[PDB]
Design brief:
This is part of a larger assembly, with 1 copy of chain A (about 325 residues), 2 copies of chain B, 3 copies of chain C, 1 copy of chain D (about 240 residues) and 1 copy of chain E (about 220 residues).
Chain C (H helix, E strand, L loop, with lengths): L1 E13 L16 E3 L12 E3 L3 H18 L8 H4 L12 E3 L5 E3 L3 H6 L3 H4 L2 E3 L4 E3 L3 E3 L3 E2 L1 H6 L6 E6 L22 E17 L26 H13 L1 H4 L16 E9 L16 H13 L5 E5 L15 H10 L2
Antiparallel strand pairs in C: 1-11, 1-12, 2-3, 4-5, 6-7, 8-11, 9-11, 10-11, 12-13
Helix pairs in contact in C: 1-6, 6-9
Chain D lengths: L2 E6 L22 H15 L9 H15 L7 E4 L3 E4 L2 E5 L11 E5 L2 E3 L3 E6 L5 H11 L14 E7 L6 E2 L4 E2 L9 E3 L13 E3 L11 E2 L6 E2 L3 E3 L2 E3 L5
Antiparallel strand pairs in D: 1-7, 1-8, 2-7, 3-6, 3-13, 4-5, 9-14, 10-12, 11-12, 15-16
Helix pairs in contact in D: 1-2, 1-3
Chain E lengths: L9 H30 L5 H13 L8 H8 L9 H17 L2 H12 L3 H10 L7 H5 L10 H14 L11 H16 L4 H16 L5 H4 L1
Helix pairs in contact in E: 1-2, 1-10, 2-8, 4-5, 5-10
The chains are: A alpha+beta (about 325), B mainly alpha (about 110), C alpha+beta (about 325), D alpha+beta (about 240), E mainly alpha (about 220).
Bound molecules: nickel (II) ion (NI) (2 copies).
Chain E binds one DNA strand of 25 nucleotides through helix 6.
Chain lengths: ~325, ~110, ~325, ~240, ~220, ~325, ~110, ~110
DNA sequence: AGACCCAGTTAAAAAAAAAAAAAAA
């Protein structure tokens, strides 16, 4: 065994570099391995020193560059470049960082420098940090190039994000998944499969998306909500970024509305997915009043609002199958 | 339990095949802060039920059937201990939700 | 002049503050929890409520209505004349006046000099990013805890059907597919012994927030950008805006609801200075708390005057038993 | 050998990492915050030796005296017995500390906090004198704020408990430098206050959940030969 | 005792599959051997024959589940139920019980689950956009509540008609079936050698879909 | 002087400490997680909790208003009289006053003497150092756990949607394509029996933090940089500015919401010397725990007086019957 | 306790099918009665329309319509008299109105 | 100009403003809750009530009836003669004119 | 400290077109 050591920074970026480690190990083999969560350490147990970790890392990085080139200085539609990043400067910093990583880690040699840390990877990142009275002229916090690349690959491949921009304002909501006691490669690959909702899905749906919460619910509809597979249950931490008039900041770091919306979706579509998909899609398309009613029944939970949504369902021609109301009653408890 | 039949027999008022569309009764049942008004709403539903049966047997579709007495017994023995308004609201909203569902009325 | 009024009023058959139904015909009244004791631990129950912005907007309505009669009504926004409480909207930099003049929002002093809507009721201009807090603080009018206790608990809401009787040009009713323009809906009406409280911190009228005090010659004086006559007229109009409050204008839907009002009990204080806000006419320990507050304020040597209607207060505080709100505002405006 | 044990039913604290645009806080108060609170109490009691030209160096010398009387830098410890949780608060905090940009520059920072019910705090000393033990006992109170001034603290009682050398599972914090062989938590909480060194602390506190969140509690404590009993239950404080 | 069609016995379908394999094995076996060696496990010709016959006898075992048996009795809608998934679970169990290899049972279960590839594709295309994110949120294995005991005993006899090894497949509940099928689907969807796995599963799938164009009309 | 107040206050229909969704129409009030006992696992309830920053800002507002209404209050910052709160930063090294004279921030005693707002509420000047902690501090205001337990499953959250009805010059309500501002925003309100605890460290007003004492001839004496009259006026102003907070000024949206304020119960402890903070009213068996603090207050013999309001705090220990917060501040200013 | 089932039986027999005597005016009077007097008149009228039900059941061969037990009348009188609150009175009246419509064991 | 009227009127034997209880035949009059102390606290009692919307409709009826006799009664809605209070219902971008034409909505002054 | 910067850019170079399997018909 090797017992890959992982430095402790914060249980958001540290879990990201742990995701990078585990994805690099599962890429190329690494059988009979496990992930041991230690609150923040998030260590890995694998019987290999360094062959397949390099093989998987170079394969993942080649896939990263290929996706960056396919997506469209060097701005693209990639999640790790502009799909979740809120800064226009990141749209050009990511290509040069990936190019430097390609020029460095391809002839079997280590890294020579470091890099900055973004808000998306760690919400606690900023160029202004106070020590005793004021801030410095630079940024004291730096991330190693290998750690930076592993955090990037974990962020793009594992944690899911929801993007919705209205003309000038732009909203991105990234909800990362963390363990509590223990996980395994089955859980790791399930979390990788959870990553969906490709960056650009906007053709006409915005005409009914209007509210940010409604768009978030619509995009969470196409996501997944099953976690009992892994034999160990998970937790979700969601952070949001906004950009109104090219001004980026944080307005939500630990909020329950994503979690309760996700639980409501999971408990609604458990009794069917076809009828649930049809119902939600129809209400979002034409019964916009019903959609706002449902979001008001979830945000500031009030049960009667659900009924009004169902009322608009009859205005929308929804089939309103037998199992949908049963699932809603099960949600009611 | 005992929600399937009451929902099925309450959904007939708002069903498309019945051209009376008693939206008001279901509205009153839905958001009822006290037990007496939701009881009045379901009473109005049961009062309109003979009209639905008559129009169903006139049209040709199978007539609706009165809810089973055990359903009424369960509703009565559950409505008494609604000390907290939250459970009462939960029951009323559940009844309203099951009042909006698809049923095989006219084959 | 800092004044604070509060009290309890009976009310019934009012459709004030409809939630709108979220797109459904059955539009419901806004309701809020009150956390009543109910002779045991604090048990919460949700009862109809009157929003604070309702009170603030109707105070604005009375304010502009009373400027309509007074000669100093030219220095007002024409939007106010439309019974519209909007200050400057969104995306608007230059505002329009009642006489048709255009006023720039870059300087707060220019706004305050020739306006009163942005002074008494504050304003917010996102384009200029200039904000001034209102001098009118409006609470939520809620049925009292003892009322809930003596009625145990109900919905306190009655649902009444309302209909449209539109027919075609021939005088016939058909489906909407041909052009029928009638459609059903319903309304919620509430009742109870509600309690309200309003705070007019009218000591900053004509005073800019950027430079509140001059101190040109090192002595305390307010920075009034207008003559004393205009400020006095504005104060009188703002105080007179309370006259509809106790008579016929609190909520909305006045055409069909017209909420039924009577002054069950009232208490107001003023001292031309900072004073504690009155406890809401909602709580069980209301009259005792008011008596204690007034006696403590008067025990500090402050020149605070209190006027009470339909309540004995404390049978020892020198407070004249008033007769109505008209003479109340009359004496509160002739006191200076 | 005595331990200054203090009970405080504080509601919240805020002690963040090197964080910007958000201030995520520690799950437990850091040793630096506890030392600063004790120094504030000592200054409030009598500034007969804490009064000098500047407040910065006065606080520095107070912390130096506290460290000198403590066994080592990583001595004071904190242990909860109630389930504490982490929540978020959005407050408009000024950011004029940056390069220029006037002075009224303020942004809505997500200054998140940690709610709890009751915690125990233990201070380790080196057999201090009776007069100084009384001074610190009366300095154990007056802890009227922890972390930032937006969230205050409130002590309940203070006592001098003995190690009593009994084997029992522990619940207090301990450095990870010497604790390797011991459901496990570990981070860095800046044990040395900065006034203008490299170590990592361990906490026996897990994550847990209710629906989709984490409320931190304690389960499966490790085994340490040093522990004591208080208020009917058993706690454990590491001794260097 | 299992039934494949509304009027056709599953035993006849099994023997038809066996005859088709016996007549096409000379053509189809070497590519299977090459791809299964590429998977990472070495084996002999008889081992390949045993593996593929165990695969064949369980190609559509899930057809005799309770839901599909009721559908065969009366035309009650399947409501999204697919027999391949239960067949995938059965194939994984018997394959792993006597081969003692995780990857062999993995590839066998994945290829048997892809026997009805285009009905599954059509169901995915009508419903949302991604395919087999976990059982289309419980939809695939929702109406399935279990299987009749005698039916599974039947395939046990089929095992005895292939080899003397006793099949120790557990009674399939909802939870275990969900767990195993999700593990299979996730491992197939995301894995560094996804291209190789797709190539080998298609190579094993070609004989399975060879049963069409005449051999399916009779059954 | 040194005061510690706490207790229980029931608040209804207040949008205090909102978030606005970060720029969305739906306005989200603060909502936190509280862990309480329900004998089936430590349950977590989503309930609003009002931060102490609002209390600090309202103390600031009352304090500056009381200086405005006091002839002795002149040394105030003109850019802080607008309820700004911000006092100093690294960008400037000179204090500005309402008069035509400025303060050179070269020492700390001078800034203590020439600015009372920087004394009571503290200040921070990174350019010249010399920090000063805020003397008044407040805790978070969240409903008590006994109340949450006795109301069982409840979230204590309601939202009322308001709207703007702006109309253009033409007599017609247009759409978004015309430029009107007729749009909705969902203001989220809160109720419940919240608990408060506020510490007033008024014993350091006019007392520099660096040199709280002089100690030239070796006798205990405070180092009051100003005359005692100004210090007494500051004490009176702070205790009077506490009145708006305890009467009707809590949280935000006061001009629109104005939370219905009435103290259900209050316990206060005051003394000349420093006193430990009284237990927050959130907990169930804290009143008796407060008696324990009283025992701690009797541990060293502190001249501490306890004021009770709708509570008893036992019978053996001395207390004071107080009918309103104004009576309490009158008792405080009596000494 | 006991009045529920018997009141439901009798009111259903008054309202159910296979009788051609569908008296809803009594049911409406029982339901919509804010005060106790009109609820009592409604239940009295329902009890009075007993001989018609008995005669029709005997004529058409239906089982005889059971009459509520005297203890049920006792409990009715106690809870009507002891509950002066219109809320509980309305609740009881509407519960009786609900029990007026029930699909019990009708004629075979 | 502004005139406010109030008072007490004794009514009997009126089914004015009856909801009907839905589609059922039992037409029930509008009832609203009111607070009456009865020397035992302001208890809530349901009492028959008349909606102010009906007062608005009947004021409309009286207004059109007394404007018919006026020489300038031509400037009225087509539905005014119809005794129909429906003004600008669903999907109405124009105004019906009693003269037999339509009125385009351009300004509130023109409408009034 | 301080500058900015935050999305459509448009001359000869290189190939031509049917199942039958069972889904909320
Ligand atoms: Ni098949
Ligand atoms: Ni087959």
């Amino acid at each position: 065994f090797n017992e890959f050591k992982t430095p402790q920074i914060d249980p958001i970026f540290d879990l990201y570099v742990a995701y990078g480690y585990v994805v690099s190990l599962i890429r190329g083999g690494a059988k009979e391995a496990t992930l041991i969560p230690h609150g923040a350490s998030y260590l890995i147990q694998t019987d290999v020193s360094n062959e397949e970790f390099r093989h998987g890392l170079v394969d993942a990085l080649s896939s990263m560059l290929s996706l960056h080139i396919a997506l469209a200085k060097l701005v693209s539609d990639a999640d790790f470049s502009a799909g979740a990043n809120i800064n226009n400067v990141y749209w050009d910093s990511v290509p040069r960082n990936l190019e430097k990583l390609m020029k460095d880690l391809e002839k079997k040699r280590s890294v020579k420098g470091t890099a900055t840390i973004p808000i998306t990877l760690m919400p606690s990142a900023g160029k202004y940090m106070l020590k005793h009275f004021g801030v410095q002229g630079g940024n004291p916090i730096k991330v190693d190039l290998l750690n930076y690349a592993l955090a990037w690959v974990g962020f793009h491949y594992y944690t899911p994000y929801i993007k919705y921009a209205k003309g000038d304002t732009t909203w991105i909501h990234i909800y990362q998944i963390a363990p509590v006691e223990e996980v395994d490669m089955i859980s790791i690959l399930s979390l990788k499969d959870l990553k969906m909702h490709l960056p650009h899905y906007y053709e006409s749906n915005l005409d009914f998306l209007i509210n940010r919460r409604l768009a978030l619910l619509y995009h969470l509809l196409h996501s997944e909500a099953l976690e009992l597979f892994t034999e160990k249950e998970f937790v979700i931490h969601s952070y949001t970024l906004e950009r109104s008039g090219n001004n980026q900041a944080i307005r939500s770091f630990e909020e329950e509305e994503i979690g309760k919306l996700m639980d409501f979706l999971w408990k609604l579509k458990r009794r069917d997915f076809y009828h649930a998909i049809k119902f939600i899609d129809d209400l979002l398309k034409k019964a916009t009043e019903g959609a706002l009613a449902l979001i008001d029944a979830i945000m500031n939970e009030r049960l009667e609002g659900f009924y009004t949504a169902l009322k608009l369902g009859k205005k929308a021609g929804v089939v309103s199958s037998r199992e949908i109301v049963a699932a809603l009653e099960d949600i009611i408890c | 339990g005992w929600i399937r039949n009451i929902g099925r027999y309450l959904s007939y008022l708002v069903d498309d095949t019945f051209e009376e569309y008693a939206y008001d009764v279901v509205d009153g049942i839905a958001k009822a802060r006290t037990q007496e008004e939701l009881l009045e709403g379901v009473y109005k539903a049961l009062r309109l039920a003979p009209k639905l049966k008559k129009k169903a047997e006139s049209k040709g579709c199978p007539p609706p059937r009165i809810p089973s007495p055990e359903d009424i017994e369960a509703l009565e023995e559950k409505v008494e201990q609604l000390s907290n308004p939250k459970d009462l609201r939960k029951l009323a909203v559940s009844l309203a939700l099951w009042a909006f569902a698809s049923w095989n009325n006219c084959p | 002049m800092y004044v604070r009024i509060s009290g309890r009023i009976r009310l019934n058959a009012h459709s004030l503050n409809a939630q709108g139904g979220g797109g459904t015909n059955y539009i419901e009244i806004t309701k809020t929890k009150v956390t009543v004791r109910t002779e045991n631990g604090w048990t919460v129950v949700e009862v109809p409520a009157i929003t604070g912005n309702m009170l603030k907007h109707w105070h604005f309505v009375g304010f502009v209505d009373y400027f309509k009669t007074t000669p100093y009504g030219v220095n007002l926004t024409e939007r106010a004349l439309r019974y519209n409480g909007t200050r400057f909207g969104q995306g608007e930099t230059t505002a329009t006046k009642a006489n048709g003049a255009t006023v720039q929002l870059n300087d707060e002093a220019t706004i305050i000099k020739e306006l009163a809507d942005a002074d008494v009721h504050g304003f917010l201009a996102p384009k200029t990013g200039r904000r001034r807090v209102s001098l009118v603080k409006a609470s939520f009018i809620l049925p009292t805890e003892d009322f809930i206790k003596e009625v145990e608990g109900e919905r306190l809401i009655t649902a009444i059907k309302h209909n449209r009787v539109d027919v075609d040009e021939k005088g016939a009713i058909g489906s909407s597919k041909e052009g029928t323009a009638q459609m059903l809906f319903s309304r919620e009406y509430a009742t109870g012994l509600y309690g309200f409280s309003i705070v007019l911190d009218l000591g900053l009228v004509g005073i800019p927030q950027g430079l509140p005090v001059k101190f040109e010659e090192n002595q305390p004086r307010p920075n009034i950008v207008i003559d004393p006559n205009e400020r006095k007229a504005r104060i009188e109009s703002a105080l007179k805006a309370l006259i509809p409050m106790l008579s016929g204008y609190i909520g909305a839907n006045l055409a069909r609801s017209f909420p039924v009002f009577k002054v069950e009990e009232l208490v107001a204080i003023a001292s031309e200075g900072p004073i504690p806000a009155l406890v809401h006419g909602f709580y069980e320990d209301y009259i005792e708390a008011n008596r204690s507050i007034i006696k403590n304020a008067r025990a500090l040597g402050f020149n605070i005057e209190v006027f009470t209607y339909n309540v004995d207060l404390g049978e020892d505080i020198e407070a004249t038993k008033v007769s109505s709100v008209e003479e109340l505002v009359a004496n509160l405006v002739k006191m200076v | 050998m005595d331990i200054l044990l203090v009970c405080l039913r504080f509601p919240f604290f805020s002690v963040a990492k090197r964080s910007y645009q958000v201030r995520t806080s520690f799950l437990l108060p850091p040793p630096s915050a506890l030392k600063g609170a004790l120094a504030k109490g000592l200054i409030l009691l009598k500034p007969e030796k804490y009064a000098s030209s500047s407040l910065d160096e006065a606080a520095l010398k107070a912390i130096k005296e506290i460290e000198s009387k403590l066994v080592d830098i990583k001595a004071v410890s904190v242990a909860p017995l109630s389930p504490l949780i982490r929540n978020a608060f959005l407050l408009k905090r000024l950011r004029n500390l940056e390069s220029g940009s006037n002075a009224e520059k303020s942004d809505a920072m997500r200054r998140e906090y940690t709610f709890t019910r009751e915690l125990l705090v233990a201070y380790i000393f080196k057999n201090l004198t009776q007069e100084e033990k009384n001074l610190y006992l009366k300095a154990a109170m007056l802890i009227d704020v922890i972390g930032d001034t937006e969230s205050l603290a409130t002590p309940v009682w203070a006592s001098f408990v003995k190690p009593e050398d009994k084997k029992a599972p522990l619940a207090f914090s301990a450095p990870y430098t010497e604790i390797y062989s011991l459901r496990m938590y570990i981070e860095k909480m800046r044990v040395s206050p900065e006034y203008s060194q490299e170590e990592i602390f361990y906490l026996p506190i897990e994550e847990r959940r209710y629906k989709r969140i984490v409320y931190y509690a304690r389960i499966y404590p490790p085994e340490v030969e040093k522990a004591l009993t208080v208020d009917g239950e058993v706690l454990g404080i590491w001794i260097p | 005792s299992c039934k494949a069609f509304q009027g056709q016995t599953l035993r006849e379908h099994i023997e038809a599959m066996l005859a088709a394999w016996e007549i096409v094995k000379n053509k189809y076996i070497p590519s299977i051997i090459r791809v299964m060696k590429t998977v990472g496990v070495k084996f002999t010709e008889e081992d390949a024959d045993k593996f593929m016959k165990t695969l064949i006898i369980l190609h559509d075992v899930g057809k005799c589940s309770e839901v599909y048996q009721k559908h065969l009795s009366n035309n009650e809608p399947l409501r999204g139920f697919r027999h391949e998934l239960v067949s995938a679970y059965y194939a994984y169990n018997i394959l792993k019980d006597m081969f003692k290899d995780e990857t062999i049972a993995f590839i066998g279960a994945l290829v048997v689950m892809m026997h009805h590839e285009p009905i599954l594709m059509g169901q995915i295309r009508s419903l949302d956009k991604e395919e087999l994110t976990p059982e289309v949120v419980l939809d695939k294995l929702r109406t399935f509540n279990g299987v009749m005991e005698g039916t599974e005993s039947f395939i046990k006899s089929m095992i005895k008609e292939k080899l003397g090894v006793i099949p120790k497949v557990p009674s399939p509940t909802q939870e275990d079936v969900l767990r195993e099928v999700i593990r299979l689907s996730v491992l197939a969807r995301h894995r560094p050698d996804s291209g190789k796995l797709r190539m080998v599963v298609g190579a094993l799938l070609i004989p399975l879909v060879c049963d069409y164009k005449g051999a399916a009309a009779a059954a």
